[PDB]
Design a protein around this ligand. Sequence first.
Ligand SMILES: *[C@@H]1O[C@H](CO)[C@@H](O[C@@H]2O[C@H](CO)[C@@H](O)[C@H](O)[C@H]2NC(C)=O)[C@H](O)[C@H]1NC(C)=O
Ligand SMILES: *[C@@H]1O[C@H](CO)[C@@H](O[C@@H]2O[C@H](CO)[C@@H](O)[C@H](O)[C@H]2NC(C)=O)[C@H](O)[C@H]1NC(C)=O
Ligand SMILES: *[C@@H]1O[C@H](CO)[C@@H](O[C@@H]2O[C@H](CO)[C@@H](O)[C@H](O)[C@H]2NC(C)=O)[C@H](O)[C@H]1NC(C)=O
Ligand SMILES: *[C@@H]1O[C@H](CO)[C@@H](O[C@@H]2O[C@H](CO)[C@@H](O)[C@H](O)[C@H]2NC(C)=O)[C@H](O)[C@H]1NC(C)=O
Ligand code: ELA
Ligand code: NAG
Ligand code: NAG
Lengths: 240, 49, 196
Amino acid sequence: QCVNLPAYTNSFTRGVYYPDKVFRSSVLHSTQDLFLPFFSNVTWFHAIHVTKRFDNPVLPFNDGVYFASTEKSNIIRGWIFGTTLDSKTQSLLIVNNATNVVIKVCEFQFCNDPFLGVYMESEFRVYSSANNCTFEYVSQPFFKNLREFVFKNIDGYFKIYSKHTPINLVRDLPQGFSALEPLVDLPIGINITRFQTLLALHRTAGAAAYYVGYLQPRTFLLKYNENGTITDAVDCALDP
Amino acid sequence: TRFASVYAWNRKRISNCVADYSVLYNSASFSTFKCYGVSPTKLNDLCFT
Amino acid sequence: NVYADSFVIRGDEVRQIAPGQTGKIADYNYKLPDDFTGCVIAWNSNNLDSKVGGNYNYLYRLFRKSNLKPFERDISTEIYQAGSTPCNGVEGFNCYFPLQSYGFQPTNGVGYQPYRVVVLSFELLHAPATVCGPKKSTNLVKNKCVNFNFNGLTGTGVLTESNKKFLPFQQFGRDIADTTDAVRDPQTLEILDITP
Ligand SMILES: *[C@@H]1O[C@H](CO)[C@@H](O[C@@H]2O[C@H](CO)[C@@H](O)[C@H](O)[C@H]2NC(C)=O)[C@H](O)[C@H]1NC(C)=O
Ligand SMILES: *[C@@H]1O[C@H](CO)[C@@H](O[C@@H]2O[C@H](CO)[C@@H](O)[C@H](O)[C@H]2NC(C)=O)[C@H](O)[C@H]1NC(C)=O
Ligand SMILES: *[C@@H]1O[C@H](CO)[C@@H](O[C@@H]2O[C@H](CO)[C@@H](O)[C@H](O)[C@H]2NC(C)=O)[C@H](O)[C@H]1NC(C)=O
Ligand SMILES: *[C@@H]1O[C@H](CO)[C@@H](O[C@@H]2O[C@H](CO)[C@@H](O)[C@H](O)[C@H]2NC(C)=O)[C@H](O)[C@H]1NC(C)=O
Ligand SMILES: CCCCCCCC/C=C\CCCCCCCC(=O)O
Ligand SMILES: *[C@@H]1O[C@H](CO)[C@@H](O)[C@H](O)[C@H]1NC(C)=O
Ligand SMILES: *[C@@H]1O[C@H](CO)[C@@H](O)[C@H](O)[C@H]1NC(C)=O
C-alpha cells in the first residue's frame, strides 16, 4: 500500500572471501579481484530510538557491495537491487519475511519507502506491482550478531558471499579477520547500479545498524591453513 | 542499384567520415562478416587511415 | 553448472552467437562472454516457426543506447530517442519503439528463415557436478597403477585411501604444483589420495 514516513567508520581488514571451490592447504595464494580496500571509510547507517533514526537510503552499487550489520532483533530483512527501481526495468528482491527466503527478479513498482511490518509479521509494503517476472528462488518455511555479505554482479551472475559471527560490542565495526564463504550464484542477468536495504518496523524502528563499503580492483595475498580455511590476507596497496 | 562484375571490380575511396555501422542494423543483413587483423568488437573505437 | 539459453533468430545471425562477435544480435540482444566455455547449437526451424502471412511473435531489439554486457537480458520497451528532441513516451520523428518483429514467412530465403539456437553453458572439472555423459563405471582398484577417470578427471596413478576432509561444496584438492592429489569418490563419498 506504499505508505510514506552521514557517518563513517573504518574497515579493519574486512570483506575477504573464498575465490574458488578448490580445496587447498598450507599455501599462500595471490589473487587479483574485487576486494574491500583495507582500512577504507565505510558509511554508517542505523535504526534506533522509537521515530528518531530509520536509515534506508538508495545507495549506489558500483562494482560490488560489502554490507555488514550489527543487530540483535532481526531488523534487516533483505535488499532491493536494480538500476531504476521502478517498473520500467527489472529488479531483484531478496527478502526474509520471517517464514521464507524469497529471491525474485521481477518488474517491481517499488514504494518510495519500502519496508516490512511487525505488529507477528503484519505488513509487506515493498512494491505496488510485480510483472514480467523471470527468476524465482525460495527456501523452506519458518549488539549480539554481526552479519557480513559481499554482493557482486559479474557475467550475468549475482554472487553472494555471507558470514554470520557472534559478537558482543556496543558501537562500531569489530576489528578482526574472518573469511566470507560462497553463499549462492544467481543467474539473474540484470543490470544493477543502485540498491536499498529492507528493514522491518514495529507498530518504531527498534535497534540495528549496518555499514556499506564498496569494492575495488585490488591485489590480495591470501594465506590458506593446513585445513582449507583462510586465516590471513595482505592488501598490497594499503602501505609500503 | 548496381554492383560491378567480379572481373572488373569497383574501388571507392572513403575519407572524412564516421563509421557508425549501426545505421546498417535497420536495413542490412549480412551472411558473412569476417575481419582480419582487427577484432569486430574493436571497430567502434578506432580511426582508420 | 549446465544452463540452457534458448531463442529463435534469423538464419543470417547464427554466426553472431559466438565469443567476440559484433552485430545487431551480439550488441543489442544477446552477448556471450569472451572466455565462454560451452557449446552453441543451432538448427533451421522454418517448418515450425514460420507461418503463411508471416509469423510476428518473435521480436528483437533494434535500438539501444549502449551494448549489452555478457549474458545480460534487456526487456525494457521505452521509446529510443535517436535525436536531441525528447520523446515523452510517444513514437514519432526521431523516436522509435526499440523492439521490431521478425517477419518469418515459409518462402523467405534461407538467410531469412528462423533458426532455433541453444547455448549450453557449463564449467568443467572444478566443482561437484551433477550432469554426466553416458559412461559405465567400474569397480575401484587401489594400490595399483591404473588409468582413472573420476567425474571426468582422467589420469594415471596409484589410488590410496585419504585422511583429508573436504567441505561439502568441494570435490577436488590440489598441491602447490596445482595438480590434483585428492579426490572424492562419486559412488562412495570417501576421500582418496592420488600418487604417481
Ligand atoms: C512470505 O513469502 C512467501 C513467498 O510468497 C509466502 O509463501 C507463499 O504464500 C502464497 C500466498 O500466501 C502461497 O500462494 C504460496 O503457495 C506460498 N508458498 C510457500 C512456498 O510458502 C508466505 O506466505 C509469506 N509469509 C508471510 C508471513 O508473509
Ligand atoms: C511484459 O509485459 C508486457 C506488458 O504487461 C507484456 O505485453 C503484454 O502481453 C500480453 C500477453 O502476452 C498481451 O496481451 C499484451 O498485448 C502485451 N502488451 C501489453 C502492452 O500489455 C509482455 O508479454 C510481457 N513479457 C515480456 C517478455 O515482455
Ligand atoms: C583443522 O582441522 C582439524 C581436524 O578437524 C581440527 O582439529 C583439532 O584437532 C586436534 C588434533 O586432533 C584436536 O586436539 C582438537 O581438539 C581439534 N579441534 C576441534 C575443534 O575438533 C583443527 O581445529 C582445525 N584447525 C587447526 C588450526 O588445526
Ligand atoms: C545499466 O544502467 C545504467 C543506468 O541506467 C546505465 O547507465 C547510463 O547509460 C546511459 C547510456 O550510456 C546514459 O544515458 C545514462 O546517463 C547512464 N546513467 C548512469 C547513472 O550511469 C548503463 O548503461 C546500464 N548498463 C548497460 C550495460 O547498458
Ligand atoms: C561505407 C564504408 C565505410 C567503411 C568504414 C571502415 C570501417 C570498417 C568497420 C566497420 C564497417 C563494416 C560494416 C559492418 C556491418 C555490421 C556487421 C554486422 O551486421 O554484424
Ligand atoms: C512519499 O514521498 C514521495 C515523494 O518523495 C511521494 O511521492 C509519496 O506520495 C509519499 N508517500 C505517500 C504515501 O504519499
Ligand atoms: C577516512 O576519512 C578520514 C577523514 O577524511 C581520513 O582522515 C582517513 O584517512 C580516511 N581513511 C580511513 C583511514 O578510513
